[PDB]
Design a protein around this ligand. Structure first.
Ligand code: DOR
Ligand code: DOR
Ligand code: ZN
Ligand code: ZN
Ligand code: ZN
Ligand code: ZN
Ligand code: ZN
Ligand code: ZN
Ligand code: ZN
Ligand code: ZN
Lengths: 362, 362
């Protein structure tokens, strides 16, 4: 007996197109999404060129419309040069992404004043998400308060960070957050197996105490999101390993395993992969869209999942229970048992749907 | 310039059919809903007969399917006799309603042990809501913890109650709550004008300090819901005034006025009248459904709104800014400028839609 889930939403994926298409492209990354039970993705702007301007957004929109197999929204990225310039296109994006720690010269911000300027100029009704680790979480929360608006913290990975966010929520501050599966299911204990290259990720893997703190504070976590960050094995194992793990194909099986073990409920999962992504990002419903999962099937994660061009996974060897059997997207069979059945270009930009605009005062 | 809102959801209405149709019926109450920008309602079970059994639910379902003009779900009511008997029909209801303070002999529970029995027997994945005032909020929260599940607190009306709920959320407990407009926009200061009969409501009107505490703790409030509780003027002004206010037609204009004053944001409103109702009750999206409001139009609430059969309102004389201009429900014009344009029976039971079942493990 299968369980029918709604179309799940991953608000944090790196699909690498334009400019990194040996790692992933819209077609391969959205195949990976569908195979993971994900019907809508929000794609990050650290591509080449980075999505930091209207022309780059226009290019990425067309590449996504032509290549995506599931529905999507595209983030804009904050730069040291673009505050006050994005107003015309801001509503067409998933939101604005701030990279507040290590990143590419183009998304690097030199000063908290630049964070301020983005919070002051980006339309106040539209989402802002931040890569903000350790004290940076507190710093960006201060900027959000000074500018009297909300912020969403990406991939919370540490006891320190979840407890800070917990304290902020207890004070009534408008902050939400997400957690990625590697920070719930991997830790320092796995670095020996992974090695120092494969194990490179930002935020880094936490201690067992970090992992246990995230589980104990599940009530504080608004969303799960993969931070699908594909790189090839050659890159991960080479001289200057880039940080990041592929994760679209493994996120739901890992979480279903936890549900079957009673570590969280089905509802907890659906708040975090459906309802809360919708409401934080004002993402529209997908008509006639659902995911059928088999909760009894036990399997072991292999050395690579079928669809991501990363062609490796840090979860290799973990035993999971639960698997995606079928995905229907807007009335068409999109995935069955290891085969994607919608072509590149089937997916659509949800921000162009009438129901997909973020409401605002006139 | 109008603002387009999604279809708003009121999770707490009393539509009085069967058995109280001089006060309201499905057709009149759902006309009131549409005129208030509400496209989906959850109807309470304290009708005559009360919806405390499968035969009464079946009757109410058919009456609603024939009379409702907007979409709906129907609550079941907990009684002193029905714990352990509702399993077959539970998934067809909005949820289970517990009346834990003053009510009708038929929904009255005599002992906290009966609350326990309901929490133990009602399917654990399905919603439970409680009318629980003052210490009863703490009591029902204890029962929810003992039985390891969530609870939703109806119409929070007091500083005491919102602070208790705040403390419970700070401890990570699975509790949500709603607030009704009369507890945000009326207080003891209005009892002289209303008089003791019209002013009768449960929970009672609070002090100015209660009202200010609810506003200050807006972050703790998950939903707004009207507790639309129509009674005729003859009843409200007579010897034994029943408690309750009509509220469907005034809720959104009152809240839009507060938005225009900067007391909360448009997003805050849409979380509380759309996204959070959806996610707490697992209510499905409504396709091709939206509400257009005019935020500039200033008017004064009259002595009665056009649609509710209550034919009175406690908000008479309040100045508001914002009004519903048009509602489209599932592709049909349902309301324009004072005229409802869908007939009785247009509305549907959302729990019968494929997307409207609450997900559960097999
Ligand atoms: O911040 C980031 C971005 C990401 C990528 O490779 O794009 N991978 C990571 O591990 N951290
Ligand atoms: O608990 C309730 C129920 C309601 C009604 O009249 O049905 N009206 C109220 O004021 N309190
Ligand atoms: Zn990041
Ligand atoms: Zn993120
Ligand atoms: Zn990322
Ligand atoms: Zn929204
Ligand atoms: Zn009540
Ligand atoms: Zn209620
Ligand atoms: Zn009520
Ligand atoms: Zn749901």
């Amino acid at each position: 007996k299968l369980v029918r889930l709604p179309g799940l939403i991953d608000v944090h994926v790196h699909l690498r197109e334009p400019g990194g298409t040996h790692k992933e492209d819209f077609a391969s990354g959205t195949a990976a999404a569908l195979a993971g039970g994900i019907t809508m993705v929000c794609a990050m702007p650290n591509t080449r060129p980075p999505i930091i301007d209207a022309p780059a957004l226009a290019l990425a929109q067309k590449l996504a419309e032509a290549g995506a197999r599931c529905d999507f929204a595209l983030f804009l990225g904050a730069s040291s040069e673009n505050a006050g310039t994005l107003g015309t296109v801001a509503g067409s994006a998933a939101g604005l992404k701030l990279y507040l720690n290590e990143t590419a010269s183009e998304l690097r911000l030199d000063s908290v004043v630049q964070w301020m300027e983005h919070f002051e100029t980006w339309p106040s009704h539209l989402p802002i998400v931040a890569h903000a680790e350790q004290q940076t979480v507190a710093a960006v929360l201060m900027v959000a308060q000074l500018t009297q608006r909300s912020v969403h913290i990406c991939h919370v990975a540490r006891k320190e960070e979840i407890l800070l966010i917990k304290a902020a929520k207890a004070r009534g501050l408008p902050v939400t957050c997400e957690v990625a599966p590697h920070h719930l299911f991997l830790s320092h204990d796995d670095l020996e197996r992974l090695g120092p290259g494969k194990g490179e990720v930002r935020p880094e893997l936490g201690s067992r105490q970090d992992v246990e703190a995230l589980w104990e504070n599940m009530a504080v976590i608004d969303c799960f999101a993969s931070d699908h960050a594909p790189h090839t094995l050659e890159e991960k194992c080479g001289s200057r390993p880039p940080p990041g793990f592929p994760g679209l194909e493994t996120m739901l099986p890992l979480l279903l395993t936890a549900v079957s073990e009673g570590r969280l409920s089905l509802d907890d999962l659906l708040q975090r992969l459906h309802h809360n992504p919708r409401r934080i990002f004002h993402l529209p419903p997908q008509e006639d869209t659902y995911v059928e999962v088999d909760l009894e099937h036990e399997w072991t994660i292999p050395s690579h999942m079928p669809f991501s061009k990363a062609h490796w996974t840090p979860f290799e060897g973990q035993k999971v229970k639960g698997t995606v059997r079928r995905v229907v997207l807007r009335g068409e069979v999109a995935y069955i048992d290891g085969q994607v059945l919608v072509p590149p270009g089937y997916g659509q930009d949800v921000r162009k749907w009438p129901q997909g605009a973020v409401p605002q005062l006139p």
